[PDB]
Amino acid sequence: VKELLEAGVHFGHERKRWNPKFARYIYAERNGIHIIDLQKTMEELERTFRFIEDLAMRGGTILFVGTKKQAQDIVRMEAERAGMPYVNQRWLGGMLTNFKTISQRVHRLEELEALFASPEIEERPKKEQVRLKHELERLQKYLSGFRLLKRLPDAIFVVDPTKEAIAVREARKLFIPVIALADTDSDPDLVDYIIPGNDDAIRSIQLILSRAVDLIIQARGGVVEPSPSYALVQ
Template identity: 30%
Template sequence: MALRKCLKCFSLLPTHVPKLPAATRCLASLPLDVVDPKNEVVREPDAGKSPLECPDYFGVNSLVTMEDLLKARVHLGHKTGLWNPLMKRFIHGSRAGLHILDLDRTLPLLHKALNVTAHVAYRGGIILFVNERPQFEGLVQRTARDCREFFITQKWRGGTLTNSYMLLGTLRLPDLMIFTSVPPSKTAVKETAMACIPSIGVVDSDCNPSQIMYPIPGNDDSPSALRLYCRLFSEAILLGKEKRKSDYADKPEPVSVRTEESTELKSNANNNS
């Protein structure tokens, strides 16, 4: 209550909280069998839809709310003198010399990024967490291990993606890159784009969002914000994997992109960390 009162005083609290339209409710969450007026059990007509046809197949939109973003200080940007003009559309205003990010823009973009993450995990894709900031090294490593994915938490070696066979001894590249904060050198971001790998990244007011496929405008310095991002990505990945197991419980699973090379990639990537 005190936090909301404080934010209202500084005009930082968004005027409304976006709600998911009724038309976008996940059809997969409905019961598979329904009863028609003749008391005959019939098959739910949308039960056979593929995950790509459902806007929120994994229910990731319920993982985070506007209040969660405010409590984690996601809306606080950098000083007004240190900003990237390309972030203008994501900035709500400024207060006390700091840019205030527009959470009305952040929340739907975060939902979209989590949905993409869950879909990649559902398909058995390889997800690589990248963070070059030493203060968050342990947090990012624990997050990747908890959801059984990969990480690089030290300085990015040039050619990791563009020359992976020479550096890692494998041609297998990640299916998704998650930047919990955009690295200052930007080498990893550029290589990700050159390798045509989808990327998700938290972009603060001083970042270039055009280099990230799924940007998330938000604070990339606050420990509370980083803990929130890591928790959300971990939960989205686990939801995707659990949904894969349940969907293919009674039938053979499709061929996964995770091969023996992916195990080698994990070993080499973690060794480089």
């Protein structure tokens, strides 16, 4: 079941703008692009989910992140469809690293989320009615998936690491298991559980991210059908 899926259209990515480190994960250079070795991919997928599973069954929260458009939306899905926090917008700086302080805003969210429905709305000038309402639009615009648990993650899953290496860094300074789906345009080393494979074609992203959440749930009870993947998927 695995192979075929991938072999389908979810491997081989960035070309001639690679990283030599990632030379251990790559089969060849066809007509230009680097054809990643799936054979090995699989092996890594294993150890990765092993970890995920050996964690999804011990009451541990994971934080997913994907700030790239050719992978935003989906990440928004797979997260809510698992209760696992996540980041789809601008991954603020010092989140994990300055959690206590970033949290401060999360609190400010509900601070308004509550003043939203109230009789205090009868008063208050249009100046603030617009200020706050707006101050919330954005407020709510960035933390939609960064609230849930008021405690750091036990790990973090990600699409293109190098794209969000900054998060990664934060993670690493705070000692936090790093797992992610990286292609040839990234350096393994600073990645703990490496999912080698295309990071732009939503095709591969969906898949590798999909079977991930399921696996997160297989260890919770409630195996069902996939999530809304197609809507304009090519």
